[PDB]
Structure 1
Amino acid sequence: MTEYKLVVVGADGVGKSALTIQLIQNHFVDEYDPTIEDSYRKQVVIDGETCLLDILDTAGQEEYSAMRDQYMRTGEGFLCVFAINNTKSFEDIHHYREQIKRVKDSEDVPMVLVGNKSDLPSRTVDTKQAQDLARSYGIPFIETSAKTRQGVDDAFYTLVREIRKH
């Protein structure tokens, strides 16, 4: 049975754990320790292939743990998440994408740009800033809400599709 090794990256606070917990447990968690970094496993059928996702929900960025360095080096695809009401999280995407590029000595790494918290009012990052950035990197952009679950499956399934394509 095929396994897809996925890494969820992005600023503290943007919804990486909430998105992961939606996928795994189908509920929205309001507070999940922002310091917990761990891996989760989910068996799913995507385009008629029963597969296993092995997902690292990252937490303590730049404080090097041997589990993160390994998923960094061995991860096959990356969800790069910012929050649409957090300008700074969106500006930070560059740094994450740069860390991914450096570790893979490649600009062709399976990646999806995720704009989360779509359910929130008066976003500060316009859809157009997100589309232009994903167009520049050559990757899909998917808007999500961990709260309502909109886009959550589509983000992870599209990443799996990007791994296949690569």
Structure 2
Amino acid sequence: STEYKLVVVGADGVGKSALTIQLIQNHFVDEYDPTIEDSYRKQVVIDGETCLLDILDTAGQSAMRDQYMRTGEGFLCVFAINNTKSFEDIHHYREQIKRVKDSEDVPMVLVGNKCDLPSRTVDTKQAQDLARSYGIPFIETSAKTRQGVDDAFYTLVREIRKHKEKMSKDGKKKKKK
């Protein structure tokens, strides 16, 4: 019943596509194609509610980017736990989102992907601390094993819901419930 526009963002090679394909098709693509942008739809029930997920799997870091950022209601901000630059990139994606959507309050979830790998270069604590600073959830995932995949996406839907209710009551000006 309720539709949610989700946008998966992050540096090339962090597993944005693999995560999305795991959610939709339930298999791991060890393959690759970092250039194209796919979108997928999925009907799921979350907390007893029927959700239509419309997910954009981005490719890159323009007059295409701005539109999809305006369209998106929530953002899955993905880095890979063995890719320091991709973790650092999160700051820049967040700033870009807040600017395009002209808001300090945008539903987001921080996702640390590839947690199946050894010798991570980005510690769980540093990612947890960042998420705490932003006031957003942090979820660790492996698109390879499928661990945390549903949780990441469902958590983002829950964040969007909380924002919806927060907006109606706002901080001041109007109030509601």
Cα deviation, residue 66, structure 1: 5.0
Q: Distance in 2 between matches of 1:35 and 1:104?
A: 25
2:66–2:100 Cα contact (<8 Å) kept: no
Q: Distance in 2 between matches of 1:19 and 1:67?
A: 22
2:23–2:149 Cα contact (<8 Å) kept: yes
Do structure 1's residue 86 and structure 2's residue 87 form an aligned pair?
no
Per-residue CA deviation, residues 102-159 of structure 1 (Å, 9 max, x unaligned), is 0122121000000000000010000011011111111000000000001000000000
Per-residue CA deviation, residues 56-90 of structure 1 (Å, 9 max, x unaligned), is 000022xxx65543220020000000000011111
Deviates more, 1:7-16 or 1:30-39: 30-39
Aligned CA-pair RMSD = 1.1
Q: Distance in 2 between matches of 1:32 and 1:21?
A: 11
Partner of 1:60: helix, strand, or coil?
coil
Q: Distance in 2 between matches of 1:113 and 1:165?
A: 16
User: Runs of 4 or more off by more than 6 Å in structure 1?
Assistant: none
Structure-to-structure mapping, 1:14-163, within 5 angstroms: 14-61=14-61, 66-163=63-160
Deviates more, 1:32-41 or 1:145-154: 32-41
Q: Distance in 2 between matches of 1:66 and 1:49?
A: 34
Cα deviation, residue 31, structure 1: 1.4
Partner of 1:82: helix, strand, or coil?
strand
What residue ranges of structure 2 are gaps of 5+ in the alignment?
A: 164-177
TM-score when scaled to structure 1? Answer: 0.94
Identical aligned pairs, as a percentage?
Answer: 99
Q: Distance in 1 between matches of 2:46 and 2:117?
A: 29
What residue ranges of structure 1 are gaps of 5+ in the alignment?
A: none
Count of residues in Structure 1 that have an aligned counterpart in Structure 2 = 162
Q: Evaluate the alpha carbon distance shift between residue 3 and residue 66 of structure 1 in structure 2; reply closer, same or farther with a 3 A threshold.
A: farther
Query: For the pair shown, which has the larger CA radius of gyration, 1 or 2?
Result: 2
Partner of 2:64: helix, strand, or coil?
helix
